[PDB]
Amino acid sequence: EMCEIPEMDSHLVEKLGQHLLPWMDRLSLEHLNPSIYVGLRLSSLQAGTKEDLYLHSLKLGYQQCLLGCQGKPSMGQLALYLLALRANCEFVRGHKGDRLVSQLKWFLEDEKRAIGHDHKGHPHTSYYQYGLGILALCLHQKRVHDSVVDKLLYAVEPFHQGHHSVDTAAMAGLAFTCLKRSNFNPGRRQRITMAIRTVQEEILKAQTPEGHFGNVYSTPLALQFLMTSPMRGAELGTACLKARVALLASLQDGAFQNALMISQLLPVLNHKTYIDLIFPDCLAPRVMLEPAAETIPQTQEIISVTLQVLSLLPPYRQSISVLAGSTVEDVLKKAHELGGFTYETQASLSGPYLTSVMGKAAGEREFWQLLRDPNTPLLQGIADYRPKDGETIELRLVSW
Amino acid sequence: SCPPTKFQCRTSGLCVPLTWRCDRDLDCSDGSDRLACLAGELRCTLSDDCIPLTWRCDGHPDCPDSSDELGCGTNE
Ligand code: CNC
Ligand SMILES: [Ca+2]
Ligand SMILES: [Ca+2]
């Protein structure tokens, strides 16, 4: 059947938008987020004249730093900037536009070379950004060579190496879908068609008993992909409705507070996906967002959190006291304030990313993994996860 | 209502740099605005730029002078 998510409560949706609203005023290149802009335009919600200023900031930052800063955007972020142009019914154009396109095309070419004629090699980034970059170029009707598409095809086709997340598979499917709708790689038409089906079954098989596809935060992008095509022979309808039940429970439980996650979910709640950026409808009516007038309550409770790092000699294990409601990053900050602990973060569209712990920076295909007790990886980053009293947070350097 | 080392625009008033002015494209509003190539690569005609062979005749001008998208199209 077909993947359909029946509309939800307008108040739940507006609540999501209000989380997104403060970011509309944060125009610092460190804070600028093309994904927020895309997600807001594809939604039923609107920020009014704030949007135009946000877009202008994106145009300033991205075109001056990539063609000229502090930390110019990555190529993956450039791809999302391209999606933002489409969200405003623009095609990338002119000499700056044309050169930005070629930069992204260089990104894919380098990543293709890294993967190799062999297909063992990893991308310097991820297959997620690989798929995202193909999608971005396709949405602006820019063609990539068959050999570039082949890498994404081989990554999901039968007897592929590695294992990919639902998120990564969904982004691949979105790329494939854009190629198919645009008739862009006729020499790979039949393989592209088969890849889309493959991604669909991989995603449905990844559906948990609670209803989510992988986890709660993979469900939005997965639903985006599933919504773009019908699935005959399969029971897509029931799968998507069970995903809705899971999604709804997570919303009412406050699972979606991170801005980029909201920006990936809002299109779904408006029956739209990134594929709607092929033929965008920029003038479709959207409800204006006003600031939530909500009085934030101040806690009076102290909680203690055990912070531990066993990846380093000598190991670190300390009980850190913070106000109830604090984030992991607050715990980290307080550990640093007590002495004996240090760390580093870098900016990303999902917020602060943990790069270094106590002098040790994650190397190639390594990262600092966040875990809680017992041996359970967090589903949120240091700025979003809020530990309970008595919980133990581990920072573990892992290879993937 | 704008700065000295930036431009101003007349319909949005959103100020714009002026290494953007005015560079044959509409950044504003209104309008008041040798090192041998690697194997498998290809050199541009009016410059030193190198591009993968697969970017020749792919519908987008990757060379500053669009050398790669001239002689399109062939047959075979
Ligand atoms: C690949 C990827 C994936 N990951 Co990771 C996973 N698993 N991630 C990152 C990878 C980065 C390295 C790499 N080679 O790219 C990788 C494999 C190490 C990974 C690790 C993180 N991930 C994890 C999560 C939970 C986040 N990640 C996602 C962005 C999940 C993503 C899926 C998704 N839906 O986005 C994902 C598929 C694609 C992200 C991307 O490239 N976006 C496009 C890119 C152009 O935007 P960007 O902002 O510039 O990308 C950077 C950031 O995304 C940063 N980053 C990656 N993950 C996070 C998570 C947070 C919370 C923050 C603040 C930044 C990041 O790394 C990217 C640069 O390489 C998120 C959806 C994944 C998910 N389904 O759970 C999720 C985030 C959930 C949320 N509520 O925000 C970890 C927290 C796991 C853990 N318990 O340790 C961990 C972050 C630890 C830390 N040091 O802060
Ligand atoms: Ca100009
Ligand atoms: Ca070309």
Short mmCIF file of N, CA and C in Angstrom, two decimals, chain A residues 53 56 59-60 63-64 93-99 101-103 105-106 109 112-113 142-143 145 147, chain B residues 14-17 20 23-27 38-41 50-52 54-55 58-63:
data_model
loop_
_atom_site.label_atom_id
_atom_site.label_comp_id
_atom_site.label_asym_id
_atom_site.label_seq_id
_atom_site.Cartn_x
_atom_site.Cartn_y
_atom_site.Cartn_z
N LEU A 53 15.64 36.96 6.27
CA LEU A 53 16.91 37.35 6.87
C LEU A 53 17.80 36.13 7.12
N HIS A 56 19.31 35.09 3.82
CA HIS A 56 20.35 36.03 3.42
C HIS A 56 21.65 35.74 4.17
N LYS A 59 23.24 32.75 2.62
CA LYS A 59 23.86 33.15 1.36
C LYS A 59 25.17 33.90 1.59
N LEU A 60 25.21 34.76 2.61
CA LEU A 60 26.43 35.48 2.95
C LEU A 60 27.53 34.53 3.40
N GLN A 63 28.65 31.58 0.75
CA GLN A 63 29.30 32.04 -0.47
C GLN A 63 30.61 32.79 -0.24
N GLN A 64 30.75 33.45 0.90
CA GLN A 64 31.98 34.18 1.16
C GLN A 64 33.07 33.28 1.70
N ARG A 93 22.85 29.35 -9.11
CA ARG A 93 23.08 30.05 -10.37
C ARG A 93 24.14 31.14 -10.26
N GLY A 94 24.56 31.66 -11.41
CA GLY A 94 25.61 32.66 -11.46
C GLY A 94 26.97 32.04 -11.23
N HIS A 95 28.02 32.86 -11.27
CA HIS A 95 29.38 32.35 -11.14
C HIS A 95 29.67 31.78 -9.75
N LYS A 96 29.19 32.43 -8.69
CA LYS A 96 29.40 31.89 -7.35
C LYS A 96 28.65 30.59 -7.20
N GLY A 97 27.42 30.59 -7.70
CA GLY A 97 26.58 29.41 -7.65
C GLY A 97 27.24 28.26 -8.39
N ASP A 98 27.68 28.54 -9.62
CA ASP A 98 28.31 27.52 -10.44
C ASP A 98 29.56 26.95 -9.79
N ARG A 99 30.31 27.78 -9.06
CA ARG A 99 31.55 27.31 -8.47
C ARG A 99 31.28 26.50 -7.20
N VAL A 101 28.68 24.60 -6.89
CA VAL A 101 28.28 23.32 -7.45
C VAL A 101 29.49 22.43 -7.72
N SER A 102 30.51 23.00 -8.36
CA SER A 102 31.71 22.25 -8.70
C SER A 102 32.49 21.84 -7.46
N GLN A 103 32.42 22.64 -6.40
CA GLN A 103 33.06 22.29 -5.14
C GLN A 103 32.42 21.03 -4.56
N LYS A 105 30.74 18.85 -6.30
CA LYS A 105 31.08 17.79 -7.24
C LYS A 105 32.49 17.27 -6.97
N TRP A 106 33.39 18.15 -6.55
CA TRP A 106 34.73 17.73 -6.15
C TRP A 106 34.69 16.89 -4.88
N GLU A 109 33.71 13.45 -5.91
CA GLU A 109 34.79 12.83 -6.66
C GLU A 109 35.90 12.34 -5.73
N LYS A 112 34.61 9.36 -3.84
CA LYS A 112 34.61 8.20 -4.74
C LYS A 112 36.00 7.56 -4.83
N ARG A 113 37.02 8.40 -4.96
CA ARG A 113 38.40 7.93 -5.04
C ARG A 113 38.82 7.22 -3.75
N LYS A 142 21.64 19.17 -11.48
CA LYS A 142 23.04 18.97 -11.80
C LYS A 142 23.35 17.48 -11.82
N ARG A 143 23.93 17.00 -12.91
CA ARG A 143 24.17 15.57 -13.08
C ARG A 143 25.50 15.12 -12.49
N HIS A 145 28.25 11.67 -12.53
CA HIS A 145 28.60 10.56 -13.40
C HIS A 145 28.14 9.23 -12.81
N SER A 147 29.70 6.53 -12.30
CA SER A 147 30.67 5.95 -11.38
C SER A 147 30.48 6.46 -9.95
N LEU B 14 18.99 44.90 2.89
CA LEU B 14 19.92 43.92 3.41
C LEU B 14 21.24 44.22 2.75
N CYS B 15 22.24 44.51 3.57
CA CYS B 15 23.52 44.92 3.04
C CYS B 15 24.33 43.68 2.59
N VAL B 16 25.12 43.91 1.54
CA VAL B 16 25.78 42.86 0.78
C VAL B 16 27.22 43.32 0.57
N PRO B 17 28.19 42.40 0.62
CA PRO B 17 29.57 42.79 0.33
C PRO B 17 29.67 43.33 -1.09
N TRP B 20 31.05 41.79 -4.60
CA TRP B 20 29.86 41.27 -5.23
C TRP B 20 29.36 42.29 -6.20
N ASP B 23 28.94 41.75 -10.08
CA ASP B 23 29.68 40.66 -10.68
C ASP B 23 28.88 39.86 -11.69
N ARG B 24 28.13 40.57 -12.53
CA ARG B 24 27.36 39.95 -13.60
C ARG B 24 26.24 39.04 -13.12
N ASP B 25 26.03 38.93 -11.80
CA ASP B 25 24.87 38.20 -11.29
C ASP B 25 24.12 38.95 -10.22
N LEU B 26 22.84 38.62 -10.09
CA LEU B 26 21.93 39.36 -9.23
C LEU B 26 21.94 38.83 -7.79
N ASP B 27 22.82 39.42 -6.98
CA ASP B 27 22.98 39.07 -5.57
C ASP B 27 21.88 39.75 -4.78
N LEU B 38 46.30 15.06 -13.07
CA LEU B 38 46.32 13.63 -12.75
C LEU B 38 45.77 12.84 -13.92
N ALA B 39 46.11 11.56 -14.00
CA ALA B 39 45.55 10.70 -15.03
C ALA B 39 44.04 10.62 -14.82
N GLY B 40 43.29 10.66 -15.92
CA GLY B 40 41.84 10.68 -15.85
C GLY B 40 41.29 12.08 -15.64
N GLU B 41 42.17 13.07 -15.64
CA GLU B 41 41.73 14.46 -15.53
C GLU B 41 41.93 15.22 -16.85
N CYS B 50 42.05 21.97 -13.37
CA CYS B 50 41.88 20.60 -13.84
C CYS B 50 40.61 19.98 -13.27
N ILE B 51 39.95 19.18 -14.11
CA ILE B 51 38.66 18.58 -13.80
C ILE B 51 38.65 17.13 -14.28
N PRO B 52 37.93 16.26 -13.57
CA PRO B 52 37.81 14.86 -14.00
C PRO B 52 37.22 14.76 -15.40
N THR B 54 35.15 12.83 -16.52
CA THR B 54 33.72 12.55 -16.46
C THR B 54 32.87 13.82 -16.33
N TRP B 55 33.52 14.95 -16.07
CA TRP B 55 32.80 16.22 -15.99
C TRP B 55 32.70 16.88 -17.35
N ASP B 58 28.71 17.21 -19.11
CA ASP B 58 27.77 16.69 -18.12
C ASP B 58 26.70 17.72 -17.77
N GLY B 59 26.63 18.78 -18.56
CA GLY B 59 25.57 19.77 -18.44
C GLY B 59 25.83 20.96 -17.54
N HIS B 60 26.99 20.98 -16.89
CA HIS B 60 27.34 22.08 -16.00
C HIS B 60 28.76 22.58 -16.30
N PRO B 61 28.92 23.90 -16.43
CA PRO B 61 30.24 24.48 -16.72
C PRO B 61 31.15 24.48 -15.50
N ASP B 62 32.06 23.51 -15.43
CA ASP B 62 32.95 23.39 -14.28
C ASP B 62 34.21 24.21 -14.47
N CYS B 63 34.49 24.58 -15.71
CA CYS B 63 35.62 25.44 -16.02
C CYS B 63 35.18 26.90 -15.99
#
